[PDB]
Amino acid sequence: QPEPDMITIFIGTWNMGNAPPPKKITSWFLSKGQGKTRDDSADYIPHDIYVIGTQEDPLSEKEWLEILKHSLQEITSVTFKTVAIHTLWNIRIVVLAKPEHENRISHICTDNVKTGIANTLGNKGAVGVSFMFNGTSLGFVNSHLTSGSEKKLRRNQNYMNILRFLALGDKKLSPFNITHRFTHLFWFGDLNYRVDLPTWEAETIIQKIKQQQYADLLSHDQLLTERREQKVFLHFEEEEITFAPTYRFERLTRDKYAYTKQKATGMKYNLPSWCDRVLWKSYPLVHVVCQSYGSTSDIMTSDHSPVFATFEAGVTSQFVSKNGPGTVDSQGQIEFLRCYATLKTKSQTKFYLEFHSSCLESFVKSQEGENEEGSEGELVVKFGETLPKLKPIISDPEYLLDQHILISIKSSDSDESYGEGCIALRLEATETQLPIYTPLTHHGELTGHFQGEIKLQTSQ
Numbered sequence: 110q111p112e113p114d115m116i117t118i119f120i121g122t123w124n125m126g127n128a129p130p131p132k133k134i135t136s137w138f139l140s141k142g143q144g145k146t147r148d149d150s151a152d153y154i155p156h157d158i159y160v161i162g163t164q165e166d167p168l169s170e171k172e173w174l175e176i177l178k179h180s181l182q183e184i185t186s187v188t189f190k191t192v193a194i195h196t197l198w199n200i201r202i203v204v205l206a207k208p209e210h211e212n213r214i215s216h217i218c219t220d221n222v223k224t225g226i227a228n229t230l231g232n233k234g235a236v237g238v239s240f241m242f243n244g245t246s247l248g249f250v251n252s253h254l255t256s257g258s259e260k261k262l263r264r265n266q267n268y269m270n271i272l273r274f275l276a277l278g279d280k281k282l283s284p285f286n287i288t289h290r291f292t293h294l295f296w297f298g299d300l301n302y303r304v305d306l307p308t309w310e311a312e313t314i315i316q317k318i319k320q321q322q323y324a325d326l327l328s329h330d331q332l333l334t335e336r337r338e339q340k341v342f343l344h345f346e347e348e349e350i351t352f353a354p355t356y357r358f359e360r361l362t363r364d365k366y367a368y369t370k371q372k373a374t375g376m377k378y379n380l381p382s383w384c385d386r387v388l389w390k391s392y393p394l395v396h397v398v399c400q401s402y403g404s405t406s407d408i409m410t411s412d413h414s415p416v417f418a419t420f421e422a423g424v425t426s427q428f429v430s431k432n433g434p435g436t437v438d439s440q441g442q443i444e445f446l447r448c449y450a451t452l453k454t455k456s457q458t459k460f461y462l463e464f465h466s467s468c469l470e471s472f473v474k475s476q477e478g479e480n481e482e483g484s485e486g487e488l489v490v491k492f493g494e495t496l497p498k499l500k501p502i503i504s505d506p507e508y509l510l511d512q513h514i515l516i517s518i519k520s521s522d523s524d525e526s527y528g529e530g531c532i533a534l535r536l537e538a539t540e541t542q543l544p545i546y547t548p549l550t551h552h553g554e555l556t557g558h559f560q561g562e563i564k565l566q567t568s569q
């Protein structure tokens with residue numbers, strides 16, 4: 110039975126509004142309702158992995174798992190296996206997978222982050238799950254960020270705390286946060302970004318929604334605008350939104366947005382907003398295609414509608430050769446030529462590189478680079494032709510061209526990373542000098558760039 114080169118992944122996010130769900134929620138898992146929806150002809154075809162994020166979830170783990178499993182069984186006639194479940198307060202993540210994947214899934218990690226301090230610590234934060242699916246690392250984050258139209262900066266701070274402190278994936282990748290640890294990272298939740306229009310425009314916004322005219326609303330969505338200004342979710346993707354705002358509804362119908370200030374809202378307006386989102390970040394040149402992104406119309410127990418997104422995602426096999434794993438394959442090598450880092454830092458320490466990859470036995474430290482002053486005030490760290498030759502464990506091009514090299518640039522003085530990036534080995538040619546490039550980030554913010562040339566030797 111051959112190993113897959115693709116899987117499909119369902120991502121769900123639902124703020125349940127502290128209310129139990131209705132008896133039928135199959136529309137969510139079928140990607141039916143508004144937006145980019147799934148074809149009826151696929152309804153019986155199970156996804157490989159279902160990842161369910163809830164917020165304001167009033168159920169026990171047992172109660173929600175029973176509902177999820179019985180839902181998927183009704184749809185697919187498959188009894189899904191529980192990969193992981195993790196809850197922080199009323200924020201929950203469930204990962205289910207087809208039984209045939211049980212022996213493909215390993216290295217399961219869970220963690221949470223609590224955001225805020227004192228007043229603002231006690232209900233917001235994130236839960237996450239990571240695991241290996243054969244040769245491919247998968248990370249999943251469900252976050253409930255700070256609420257309120259006037260708190261977009263707080264949400265951006267919540268995001269940075271979550272990506273710094275959520276401990277998922279391979280702990281040997283010590284310079285790297287979750288935005289570099291995974292082949293595919295999915296980040297979803299009640300991100301709580303609002304449509305930033307005046308309160309007086311509430312009825313005009315409602316009109317626009319009834320006409321399915323979302324363009325003038327999305328142009329004011331705080332998540333889109335903050336992402337355009339590189340304030341949050343740098344280097345993440347989001348499918349185009351073609352569904353109505355998923356908040357704030359009167360419960361038990363979808364006919365009414367409940368936006369007016371009430372004692373129950375702390376006298377805050379809740380203009381219709383796309384609070385409930387799914388974003389992703391995959392390593393360069395790995396296949397990932399969003400095949401649905403939408404909201405249900407028929408689940409009305411909460412003041413939020415459920416959101417679904419589905420993806421085709423490239424996966425690789427757990428490669429064995431006569432040589433690697435447990436030795437090198439002299440026939441393979443990775444060379445870096447004419448490489449330099451450009452850093453936004455004011456620091457004048459010397460820097461070195463670390464090269465991390467599951468195609469290496471262990472990470473590789475470079476010699477210190479040569480600092481020069483760049484014209485426009487920046488630091489340029491030149492490595493020229495000094496970088497070590499990397500010795501992959503397997504030289505077969507079917508393996509090596511699918512791999513990635515994580516790069517950290519570190520201070521000689523403090524051994525702290527000033528920037529992290531990723532280079533694909535999915536090259537146009539082997540035994541040929543080719544340009545490479547990655548932006549460098551630290552704590553998920555832009556700190557520089559790394560560019561140069563690569564020369565990859567495979568067994569072919």
Ligand SMILES: COc1ccc(NC(=O)Nc2cccs2)cn1
Nearest residue numbers: 333334336337338343344345346
């Ligand atoms: C390689 O990482 C990425 C990922 C996405 C992108 N493009 C964007 O982020 N485009 C956006 C327009 C407005 C908000 S965001 C570039 N590089």
